Design an enzyme around this catalytic site. Structure first.
Site, PDB file in Angstrom:
ATOM      1  N   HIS A   1       6.161   7.064   5.989  1.00  0.00           N
ATOM      2  CA  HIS A   1       5.736   6.675   4.634  1.00  0.00           C
ATOM      3  C   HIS A   1       5.101   7.863   3.944  1.00  0.00           C
ATOM      4  O   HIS A   1       4.898   8.901   4.578  1.00  0.00           O
ATOM      5  CB  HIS A   1       4.763   5.501   4.706  1.00  0.00           C
ATOM      6  CG  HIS A   1       3.517   5.836   5.466  1.00  0.00           C
ATOM      7  ND1 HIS A   1       3.426   5.712   6.848  1.00  0.00           N
ATOM      8  CD2 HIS A   1       2.365   6.399   5.040  1.00  0.00           C
ATOM      9  CE1 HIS A   1       2.221   6.156   7.207  1.00  0.00           C
ATOM     10  NE2 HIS A   1       1.563   6.613   6.119  1.00  0.00           N
TER      11      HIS A   1
ATOM     12  N   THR B   1      -5.389   6.502   8.426  1.00  0.00           N
ATOM     13  CA  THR B   1      -6.035   6.748   7.125  1.00  0.00           C
ATOM     14  C   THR B   1      -6.071   5.484   6.286  1.00  0.00           C
ATOM     15  O   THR B   1      -6.588   5.552   5.177  1.00  0.00           O
ATOM     16  CB  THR B   1      -5.327   7.850   6.362  1.00  0.00           C
ATOM     17  OG1 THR B   1      -4.024   7.368   5.963  1.00  0.00           O
ATOM     18  CG2 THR B   1      -5.243   9.143   7.147  1.00  0.00           C
ATOM     19  N   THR B   2      -5.561   4.382   6.792  1.00  0.00           N
ATOM     20  CA  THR B   2      -5.710   3.053   6.136  1.00  0.00           C
ATOM     21  C   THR B   2      -6.314   2.112   7.144  1.00  0.00           C
ATOM     22  O   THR B   2      -6.180   2.301   8.349  1.00  0.00           O
ATOM     23  CB  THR B   2      -4.399   2.463   5.645  1.00  0.00           C
ATOM     24  OG1 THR B   2      -3.506   2.285   6.746  1.00  0.00           O
ATOM     25  CG2 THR B   2      -3.728   3.325   4.629  1.00  0.00           C
TER      26      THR B   2
ATOM     27  N   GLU C   1      -3.577  13.383   1.335  1.00  0.00           N
ATOM     28  CA  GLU C   1      -4.764  12.880   2.094  1.00  0.00           C
ATOM     29  C   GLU C   1      -5.457  14.084   2.709  1.00  0.00           C
ATOM     30  O   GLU C   1      -6.610  14.360   2.408  1.00  0.00           O
ATOM     31  CB  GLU C   1      -4.282  11.858   3.127  1.00  0.00           C
ATOM     32  CG  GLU C   1      -3.710  10.642   2.431  1.00  0.00           C
ATOM     33  CD  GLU C   1      -3.844   9.399   3.210  1.00  0.00           C
ATOM     34  OE1 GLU C   1      -3.381   9.347   4.354  1.00  0.00           O
ATOM     35  OE2 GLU C   1      -4.447   8.440   2.680  1.00  0.00           O
TER      36      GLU C   1
ATOM     37  N   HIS D   1       3.948  11.080   6.159  1.00  0.00           N
ATOM     38  CA  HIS D   1       3.471  10.767   7.501  1.00  0.00           C
ATOM     39  C   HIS D   1       4.610  10.168   8.327  1.00  0.00           C
ATOM     40  O   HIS D   1       5.064   9.052   8.036  1.00  0.00           O
ATOM     41  CB  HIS D   1       2.321   9.761   7.423  1.00  0.00           C
ATOM     42  CG  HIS D   1       1.084  10.352   6.841  1.00  0.00           C
ATOM     43  ND1 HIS D   1       0.030   9.619   6.335  1.00  0.00           N
ATOM     44  CD2 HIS D   1       0.759  11.649   6.699  1.00  0.00           C
ATOM     45  CE1 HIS D   1      -0.892  10.430   5.899  1.00  0.00           C
ATOM     46  NE2 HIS D   1      -0.519  11.702   6.129  1.00  0.00           N
TER      47      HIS D   1
ATOM     48  N   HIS E   1       0.847  -1.227   0.000  1.00  0.00           N
ATOM     49  CA  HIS E   1       0.000   0.000   0.000  1.00  0.00           C
ATOM     50  C   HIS E   1       0.866   1.253   0.000  1.00  0.00           C
ATOM     51  O   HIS E   1       0.363   2.297  -0.477  1.00  0.00           O
ATOM     52  CB  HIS E   1      -1.075   0.067   1.105  1.00  0.00           C
ATOM     53  CG  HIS E   1      -0.725  -0.473   2.450  1.00  0.00           C
ATOM     54  ND1 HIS E   1      -0.372   0.350   3.517  1.00  0.00           N
ATOM     55  CD2 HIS E   1      -0.760  -1.734   2.929  1.00  0.00           C
ATOM     56  CE1 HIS E   1      -0.157  -0.394   4.580  1.00  0.00           C
ATOM     57  NE2 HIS E   1      -0.362  -1.666   4.247  1.00  0.00           N
TER      58      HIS E   1
ATOM     59  N   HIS F   1       1.963   9.116   0.865  1.00  0.00           N
ATOM     60  CA  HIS F   1       0.805   8.893  -0.011  1.00  0.00           C
ATOM     61  C   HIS F   1       0.989   9.818  -1.203  1.00  0.00           C
ATOM     62  O   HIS F   1       1.446  10.930  -1.010  1.00  0.00           O
ATOM     63  CB  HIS F   1      -0.543   9.160   0.694  1.00  0.00           C
ATOM     64  CG  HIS F   1      -0.700   8.429   1.974  1.00  0.00           C
ATOM     65  ND1 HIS F   1      -1.413   7.253   2.043  1.00  0.00           N
ATOM     66  CD2 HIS F   1      -0.231   8.649   3.235  1.00  0.00           C
ATOM     67  CE1 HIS F   1      -1.360   6.823   3.322  1.00  0.00           C
ATOM     68  NE2 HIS F   1      -0.613   7.627   4.068  1.00  0.00           N
TER      69      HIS F   1
HETATM   70  C1  LIG Z   1      -1.581  -6.536  17.720  1.00  0.00           C
HETATM   71  C2  LIG Z   1      -0.423  -5.780  17.100  1.00  0.00           C
HETATM   72  C3  LIG Z   1      -0.542  -5.054  15.976  1.00  0.00           C
HETATM   73  N1  LIG Z   1       0.485  -4.297  15.444  1.00  0.00           N
HETATM   74  C4  LIG Z   1       0.190  -3.356  14.334  1.00  0.00           C
HETATM   75  C5  LIG Z   1      -0.070  -4.023  12.991  1.00  0.00           C
HETATM   76  C6  LIG Z   1      -1.549  -3.763  12.669  1.00  0.00           C
HETATM   77  N2  LIG Z   1      -1.823  -3.416  11.266  1.00  0.00           N
HETATM   78  C7  LIG Z   1      -1.104  -2.643  10.425  1.00  0.00           C
HETATM   79  C8  LIG Z   1      -1.846  -2.582   9.275  1.00  0.00           C
HETATM   80  C9  LIG Z   1      -1.673  -1.722   8.065  1.00  0.00           C
HETATM   81  N3  LIG Z   1      -2.243  -0.416   8.360  1.00  0.00           N
HETATM   82  C10 LIG Z   1      -1.452   0.546   8.850  1.00  0.00           C
HETATM   83  O1  LIG Z   1      -0.245   0.349   9.064  1.00  0.00           O
HETATM   84  N4  LIG Z   1      -2.076   1.738   9.134  1.00  0.00           N
HETATM   85  C11 LIG Z   1      -1.408   2.887   9.604  1.00  0.00           C
HETATM   86  C12 LIG Z   1      -0.462   2.810  10.622  1.00  0.00           C
HETATM   87  C13 LIG Z   1       0.187   3.955  11.046  1.00  0.00           C
HETATM   88  C14 LIG Z   1      -0.082   5.168  10.454  1.00  0.00           C
HETATM   89  C15 LIG Z   1      -1.038   5.254   9.435  1.00  0.00           C
HETATM   90  S1  LIG Z   1      -1.388   6.833   8.708  1.00  0.00           S
HETATM   91  N5  LIG Z   1      -1.517   6.689   7.118  1.00  0.00           N
HETATM   92  O2  LIG Z   1      -2.656   7.221   9.274  1.00  0.00           O
HETATM   93  O3  LIG Z   1      -0.230   7.627   9.002  1.00  0.00           O
HETATM   94  C16 LIG Z   1      -1.704   4.109   8.998  1.00  0.00           C
HETATM   95  N6  LIG Z   1      -2.958  -3.349   9.449  1.00  0.00           N
HETATM   96  N7  LIG Z   1      -2.955  -3.845  10.667  1.00  0.00           N
HETATM   97  C17 LIG Z   1      -1.922  -2.582  13.570  1.00  0.00           C
HETATM   98  C18 LIG Z   1      -3.333  -2.583  14.116  1.00  0.00           C
HETATM   99  O4  LIG Z   1      -3.989  -3.846  14.027  1.00  0.00           O
HETATM  100  O5  LIG Z   1      -1.003  -2.655  14.679  1.00  0.00           O
HETATM  101  C19 LIG Z   1       1.746  -4.294  16.016  1.00  0.00           C
HETATM  102  O6  LIG Z   1       2.684  -3.650  15.571  1.00  0.00           O
HETATM  103  N8  LIG Z   1       1.864  -5.062  17.153  1.00  0.00           N
HETATM  104  C20 LIG Z   1       0.864  -5.800  17.768  1.00  0.00           C
HETATM  105  O7  LIG Z   1       1.088  -6.364  18.830  1.00  0.00           O
HETATM  106 ZN   LIG Z   2      -0.197   7.599   6.037  1.00  0.00          ZN
END
Ligand SMILES: Cc1cn([C@H]2C[C@H](n3cc(CNC(=O)Nc4cccc(S(N)(=O)=O)c4)nn3)[C@@H](CO)O2)c(=O)[nH]c1=O
Ligand SMILES: [Zn+2]
Length: 258
Positions: free
Chosen positions: A92, A196-197, A104, A117, A62, A94
């Site tokens: 990262h 935002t994702t 965004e 971001h 992504h 966008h």
């Molecule tokens: C349980 C657990 C989970 N996790 C992480 C992985 C898990 N995860 C990541 C993605 C992809 N999505 C993003 O990265 N989204 C995003 C993350 C940061 C900033 C932004 S933004 N664009 O707004 O700046 C967006 N999908 N699911 C997330 C929540 O489930 O927590 C961990 O590191 N340790 C743990 O123990």
């Molecule tokens: Zn972002």
């Protein structure tokens, strides 16, 4: 049939797997600069990146993440609207298919070519995965990119992208200094929002800098050569990986500046 940025899996679909997509504090938003209120009680931002330790760059399908060692207070954000200390974990971007879109957040409905971001987690919650379950878990510093002069401090990122073209590829990426991505001014807007994702968790204090950075057309063109797909899969350019502006609802955007 996983979420993404296509016709059949893009932002307008996300609410089926992630119902918080229609929540009360979703991001990004349009920043109406005339409605934002100056808050003279907001502190200067404190960005302390001198000891930052970058480790790796990853194409996650992504975007690409530049990841940091967050096992110690080495690169931290504090002050501004924040209580306590937030540690840098990754940055990262966008970006768009064209220079006319890609950010965004928008400013008086203006779209920038891209948005950086810098993601930080509140050290009172111990790790990133616990932080994202809290309404004050994350602080994301957002920086707009416009196309003009090159950003010299971006070029080291641009030149490694050929090695991570496809989803799941990573490359060592040590000694990268994120101070080279910051504009001169730390004037900002701030509001409570979300990732935002997916999973779109409502855990972010957004800090959006007013001053964009300039990058060259050649630098953004290299972002647009990345792929959403894995190696040996049909090529789909990684472009237009932005979520559009979401309803502001019962929120106020505050300005650090007059
Ligand atoms: C349980 C657990 C989970 N996790 C992480 C992985 C898990 N995860 C990541 C993605 C992809 N999505 C993003 O990265 N989204 C995003 C993350 C940061 C900033 C932004 S933004 N664009 O707004 O700046 C967006 N999908 N699911 C997330 C929540 O489930 O927590 C961990 O590191 N340790 C743990 O123990
Ligand atoms: Zn972002």
């Amino acid at each position: 049939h996983h979420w993404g940025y296509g016709k059949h899996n893009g932002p307008e679909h996300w609410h089926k797997d992630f119902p918080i997509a229609k929540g009360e504090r979703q991001s990004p938003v349009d920043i109406d600069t005339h409605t934002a209120k100056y808050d003279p009680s907001l502190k200067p931002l404190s960005v302390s990146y001198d000891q930052a330790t970058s480790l790796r760059i990853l194409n996650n399908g992504h975007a690409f993440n530049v990841e940091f060692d967050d096992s110690q207070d080495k690169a931290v954000l504090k002050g501004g609207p924040l209580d306590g200390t937030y540690r840098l974990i990754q940055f990262h971007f966008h970006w768009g298919s064209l220079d006319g879109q890609g950010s965004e957040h928008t400013v008086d409905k203006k779209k920038y070519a891209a948005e950086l971001h810098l993601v930080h987690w509140n050290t009172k919650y111990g790790d990133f995965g616990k932080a994202v379950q809290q309404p004050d878990g994350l602080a994301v510093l957002g920086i707009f990119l416009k196309v003009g002069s090159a950003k010299p401090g971006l070029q080291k990122v641009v030149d490694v992208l050929d090695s991570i073209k496809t989803k799941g590829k990573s490359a060592d990426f040590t000694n990268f200094d994120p101070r080279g991505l910051l504009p001169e001014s730390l004037d900002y807007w701030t509001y409570p929002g979300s990732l935002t994702t997916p999973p779109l968790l409502e855990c972010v204090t957004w800090i959006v800098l007013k001053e964009p950075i300039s990058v060259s057309s050649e630098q953004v063109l290299k972002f647009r050569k990345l792929n959403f797909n894995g190696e040996g899969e049909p090529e789909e350019l990684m472009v237009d990986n932005w979520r559009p502006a979401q309803p502001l609802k019962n929120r106020q955007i505050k300005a650090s500046f007059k």
